[PDB]
C-alpha cells in the first residue's frame, strides 16, 4: 500500500523564485504544498489511498438491474445504464476492462433457473418455452433459500475496453437507422429468469461487481440526472399532459447561496 | 487450488477471472494529469 | 522566451507569444505497433502529405458567444490528402497536433477554454428519446457554434445540445480540466497548443463513423473591447495529423 | 493452452508457383494464409481456440431428459436421443467415448429416490414396488431442498466408443425384427424415480455432461429437425386428419435470397 | 508450368497461361535516390494504398478493330488513392506493372502486339499544324480505340492519327518491338506482363501535364472465331503503380 | 486426496471417472482432414 508524503519541516524563506506564482492558462495544476506557503513542522503521516483506488471505488458489487417474474418469468439485458448511482461511478471514465462477479438476490423461493443467453440468439420468451433446454446456453439451477448464486463474467469486449461513452454510429452517413453512443458497440448478454415452483415474490435483484478493473481516460463527473439509458441527454421532461408541455428540467446539483464574500 | 511470517494466494476456480479483487499495486503517477506538458 | 516553432513537414507554425505544450497524457502519437495490431494487411502511412498543419475557418468571438466543437478526424474530411485517405480505407488511427490562436490587444480582456475530449457524446437538444444524428455531429470542418441553452432551441432532426455550462453532455464546465487543455488569457498568450496521440480502446476504426476527439473553445470569460473599437476577434484552427495510419483500401466512402 | 499462429509480414511478390491456384477435386482443404494473397503486416496473436476443443464444445451438461412423477413414480431410459440441441452436438462424431455426470434438477420437495437400475434386469414399476428394495442396484436417496444429487457414470461400452451412427443391425438377414441403428448397440442403463413423501411439484430434469471425451470420425452437421430418436429419419408428417394425410416436411434450416449477386 | 502469380499489396494477378514476365530495360522500378534528387522536400510513399492493382474498362476485341491505346500515369487518374496523389502534388513518379488479358478458345485464332512505349507523342490527324489537345491525349482509364486511317476521319479539335501501322506517330508498326512488348497469341498464352521502371530524364514531374508511358495493343492478326459464334473477345488492361512517389503538396490541381 | 508458483490437482473420490474435466491437451493435428493425402 502506499502511504501520503510527510510534510517536511520548512522555515522563513526568502526567495527570487515564486512557487506560489504560476499561470492558469498552462493547462497544468499547481505543485503547491504546505511547505512552499507557510512554514511547517515535520509530521509522519501514514495515511493510505488505498480506498481510492479504481479497484475498490468500482468494486463494491451495486445494484444494477430489477426485473419481476410475471408468470414466474423474467428477462433482464445486462447493462449499467439503468441505475444513476452505478452509471455515474463507471462514467468518471471513458473506458472500462472489467470482469464482473454477478449475484442474483431473489424474494422468491422453491427453484429458479436463470440461463445466461450470449449474444446473436433468441432467448426464451416465457417459462415452459422449449428454448429453456439448451445445450450449450450456460444456465444456473438454485434454490433461493439456503444461498444467493453467483457467477463471474469475464471481459467481453469486442475491444480491448468497454466504451463508457462513444461519439461514432454504427451506420455510414445517409442511413436513416443510425445509432449514437454505446449500445451498439458491445453487447454483454441477458439473463433469462424462471420459477420452477410458485412459492415466494417476484422480485429479482441483480448485483453486479467489476472486478480486475483497468479505467482509461478521466472525464468530468455527471452533473445532472440521467433521463434516458444509453444516452447522455439530461433535459427531462416533466409533464406531457398541457401547456407545460415542451419544458424541460436540467435538474443539476449546483446550489446558490444569498451573497458571494458572505457564505 | 492454483498457485501459491507466510502468505498463501489461492485460487479455487483455476480461472483468472474467478478470482477476487487484484490488490497488488503499482502502476501510478498523476503526472499524466495536473503535469501533462511537453517541457 | 514565449517563442515557439512547430514544423509538421510541410508547414510551419510559428507562435510569438505561447505556453508551453500540453502533451496529453504525457504521451506522443505512435504508429500501431505490431503487438497491439488487429488487422492482418500491411497499413499506409502517407507521412508528410497527410500529416501536417490544416487550418480551418476562423470563428468570430464576440460578447456573448457561447463557444464552438470541432469534431476529429471529422474537421479534416475535405483537408488535404488526408481527408482523401479517410474514404478510400476502412480503417484509420492518429494523432493531433491542436493549434489554437486568438489574438487581440493589451486592452481587450477575455478567457478561453481550449480543451480536447476524448470520447465527447452530445446530448440531445431536450425532450424525448433520439439519437442525435449523423449530420449534426458532421459538421466538418465548419465545426458547430454553441448557440447557447433555451427553451426555444428547435428540437427537431435530432438536434445537439447548445448549453456549454453541462459541455453539452450534461457534465459541469470547469471540471473539463480533467481532458486536455489550456485557456486563452488575453491577457497572457494568444494561441494554445496540444499534441494528442491517438486514443481509443481500438487500434483503428472508421474515420467517418467514429468522430475519436473533439475540439472545444468555450469563452470562458467574455470578451471586453477596453478602450478600442474592437467587440470581435477571429479564433484560428490548425491541427496537423501526426503518426497517421490507413488500413483497409476500398472505393471511396464517399458519394 | 495453444494460441492461433501470428500473422507474418509478407511484401509484393512475383511468383511461378501460384499458391492460390490448386485443385478442389483432390479432395484436400486450402493451404492458402492472407500471406499468399494479399500484403501483410506482423500481428501478434493470442487468440486460442481452447474453447472450441471437443471436451470444452461438449462438456456442458445439456438436458437430456424430462420426466414427470404421475403417482410419486418416474421412469428414464438414458439417452441423448430425445433433446435436438444436444443431440446435433454428439452427431458431429461417430463415436464417442465419456463418461457422464448426472445431475437431477427437481421441483419436488420432501425426499426423492433414484435407483440406476442396470442393463439386463427388471426395475421397479411403481412406488411401493418391491424392487426398490435392492442389495446391489446402486440408488441415490436426496432431500431436494438443500442441493441437487449429482453423480459420475464411467464409460459403459461393449466397445471402445459408443457409436453415435451404426449401419448395421443386431440379427441376420432373414429376420423379421431386425431393428436398425445404433439402439441395439448399446444401452446406458435407466434411471427409476419416486418420492417418499408428497410435497412439491412433479417434474424431474436430467442433466448430463460428457467427460473424459474422445470423438472420433467427424460427420456433417444435423441438417434438418428431428422426427424420430434412434433414426435419423427427416422426414416429419405433421398430420394425420386428411387429404394432407402423406404430405411429409423436412423442415431444413435453409433460407433463401431474392437474387445471387444482389446480397 | 505456365503459372504466374503477381502479388502487389492488396490485389493479386493469377496467371496459368502464361510468358516470362517482360521487366523493361532490366530495370525494376526504384524509388528516387538522394543522388538523382532535384526538390528539397520530403516525398510520399503511399506504397500499398496506391501500389496495387488497378483493373480498366475492358475493350471488346473484334473483326476490324485496329487497336487501344491508354496513357499512363492518365489511365489511373481517377483510380483509388493513386489517382487522389496525382492531383494533391506537384510532381510524382511511379513504375507499373501493367498486366494484358485476352483469353478466347482453342479454336480461335488472333495475334495482339501489347507494347510500352516511352513519350510517345501522337501525330495530328492530318493537315496543318495543330497540336494534338489535351483532351484528347488524356482519355482517362476508357483510353483510345483507335478506330483507323481514312481521309474521313474528323480533323477538328486537334484529334490525334488514328492508324495503327505507323503507330499513330509517323513510325512503322513492326518496328514496335524496339519497346519493351510482348505478343498475345491465342494459340500460345492468353495475357501478358511488362514491368517497366519509371521512365524520364527528370527525377518527377506533373502527372497531370506529363504523360510518360503508353499502353498499345494493336490487333497484329485479326480474330478468326474459327468454328464457333463467338466472333469477339474482350481484352481487360489491370495496372499497379510500383515504387510510386510524390512530392510537392498542394491544392487539388482538380477542379 | 489422490495425487499432487505452485498447482495442485486434487482428486477427491479417488476415481478416475469422478474428476472433473480433462484440461490438459496435447494431441492434435488439422491434417487428418484439409490434407488426407498419400503425397
Redesign the interface.
Known amino acids: 500500500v502506499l502511504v501520503v508524503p510527510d510534510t517536511k519541516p520548512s522555515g522563513p524563506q526568502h526567495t527570487t523564485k515564486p512557487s506560489i506564482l504560476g499561470?492558469?492558462?498552462?493547462?497544468?495544476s499547481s505543485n503547491a504544498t504546505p511547505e512552499s506557503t507557510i512554514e511547517t513542522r515535520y509530521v509522519y503521516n501514514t495515511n493510505t489511498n488505498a480506498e481510492a483506488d479504481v479497484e475498490m471505488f468500482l468494486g463494491r458489487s451495486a445494484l444494477w438491474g430489477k426485473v419481476t417474474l410475471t408468470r414466474q418469468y423474467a428477462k433482464w439485458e445486462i447493462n449499467f445504464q439503468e441505475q444513476a448511482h452505478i452509471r455515474k461511478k463507471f462514467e468518471f471514465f471513458?473506458?472500462l476492462?472489467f470482469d464482473m462477479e454477478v449475484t442474483i438476490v431473489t424474494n422468491n423461493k422453491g427453484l429458479m433457473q436463470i440461463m445466461f443467453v450470449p449474444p446473436g440468439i433468441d432467448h426464451p420468451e416465457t417459462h415452459d418455452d422449449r428454448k429453456w433446454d439448451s445445450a450449450s446456453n450456460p444456465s444456473v439451477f438454485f434454490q433461493p433459500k439456503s444461498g444467493f448464486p453467483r457467477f463471474t463474467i469475464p471481459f467481453t469486449?469486442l475491444?480491448?475496453?468497454?466504451?463508457?461513452?462513444?461519439?461514432?454510429?454504427?451506420?455510414?452517413?445517409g442511413?436513416d437507422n443510425?445509432?449514437?453512443?454505446?449500445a451498439p458497440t458491445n453487447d454483454m448478454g441477458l439473463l433469462c429468469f424462471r420459477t420452477l415452483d410458485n412459492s415466494g415474490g417476484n422480485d429479482v435483484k441483480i448485483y453486479v461487481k467489476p472486478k480486475h478493473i483497468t479505467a482509461?481516460?478521466?472525464?468530468?463527473?455527471?452533473?445532472?440526472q440521467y433521463?434516458?439509458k444509453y444516452?447522455?441527454?439530461?433535459?427531462y421532461?416533466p409533464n406531457s399532459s398541457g401547456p407545460d408541455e415542451?419544458?424541460?428540467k436540467?435538474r443539476?446539483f449546483?446550489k446558490t447561496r444569498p451573497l458571494i464574500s458572505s457564505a | 487450488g492454483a498457485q501459491v511470517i507466510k502468505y498463501f494466494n489461492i485460487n479455487y476456480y483455476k480461472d483468472s477471472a474467478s478470482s477476487g479483487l487484484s490488490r497488488q499495486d503499482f502502476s501510478q503517477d498523476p503526472?499524466?494529469?495536473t503535469?501533462?506538458?511537453?517541457? | 522566451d514565449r517563442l515557439k516553432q512547430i514544423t509538421i513537414?510541410?508547414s510551419t507554425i510559428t507562435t510569438q507569444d505561447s505556453?508551453?505544450?500540453?502533451?496529453?497524457?504525457?504521451?506522443w502519437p505512435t504508429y500501431l505497433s505490431?503487438?497491439d495490431?488487429?488487422?492482418?494487411?500491411?497499413?499506409?502511412?502517407?507521412?508528410?502529405?497527410?500529416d501536417?498543419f490544416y487550418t480551418l475557418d476562423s470563428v468570430e468571438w464576440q460578447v456573448g458567444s457561447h463557444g464552438w466543437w470541432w469534431?476529429l478526424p471529422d474537421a479534416l474530411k475535405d483537408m488535404?490528402?488526408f481527408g482523401?485517405?479517410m474514404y478510400?480505407?476502412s480503417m484509420g488511427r492518429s494523432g493531433f497536433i491542436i493549434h489554437t490562436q486568438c489574438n487581440a490587444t493589451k486592452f481587450h480582456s477575455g478567457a478561453l477554454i481550449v480543451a480536447v475530449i476524448?470520447?465527447?457524446?452530445?446530448?440531445?437538444?431536450?425532450?424525448?428519446?433520439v439519437?442525435?444524428?449523423?449530420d449534426h455531429?458532421?459538421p466538418g470542418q465548419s465545426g458547430h457554434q454553441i448557440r447557447g441553452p433555451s427553451?426555444s432551441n428547435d428540437?427537431s432532426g435530432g438536434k445537439p445540445?447548445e448549453?456549454p455550462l453541462?459541455?453539452c453532455?450534461?457534465?459541469?464546465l470547469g471540471?473539463?480540466?480533467?481532458?486536455?487543455?489550456?485557456?486563452?488569457?488575453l491577457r497572457?498568450?494568444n494561441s494554445s497548443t496540444?499534441?494528442v496521440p491517438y486514443?481509443n480502446?481500438?487500434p483503428m476504426?472508421?474515420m467517418?463513423?467514429?468522430?475519436?476527439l473533439?475540439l472545444v473553445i468555450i469563452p470562458l470569460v467574455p470578451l471586453r473591447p477596453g478602450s478600442s473599437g474592437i467587440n470581435s476577434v477571429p479564433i484560428t484552427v490548425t491541427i496537423a495529423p501526426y503518426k497517421s495510419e490507413?488500413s483497409g483500401?476500398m472505393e471511396a466512402?464517399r458519394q
Open positions: 499561470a492558469m492558462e498552462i493547462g497544468a471513458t473506458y476492462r469486449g475491444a480491448s475496453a468497454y466504451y463508457m461513452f462513444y461519439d461514432g454510429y454504427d451506420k455510414p452517413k442511413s443510425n445509432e449514437y453512443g454505446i482509461w481516460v478521466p472525464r468530468p463527473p455527471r452533473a445532472t433521463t434516458h444516452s447522455t441527454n439530461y433535459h421532461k415542451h419544458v424541460l436540467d443539476h449546483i | 503526472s499524466k494529469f503535469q501533462p506538458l511537453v517541457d | 513537414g510541410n505556453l508551453h505544450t500540453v502533451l496529453a497524457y504525457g504521451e505490431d503487438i495490431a488487429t488487422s492482418v494487411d500491411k497499413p499506409t502511412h502517407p507521412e508528410t502529405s497527410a501536417r469534431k488535404g490528402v482523401q485517405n478510400y480505407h476524448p470520447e465527447h457524446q452530445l446530448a440531445y437538444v431536450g425532450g424525448v428519446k439519437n442525435v444524428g449523423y455531429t458532421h427553451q428540437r445540445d448549453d453541462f459541455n453532455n450534461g457534465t459541469l471540471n473539463i480540466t480533467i481532458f486536455p487543455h489550456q485557456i486563452i488569457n497572457t498568450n496540444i499534441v486514443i480502446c481500438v476504426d472508421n467517418l463513423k467514429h468522430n475519436n473533439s490507413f483500401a466512402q
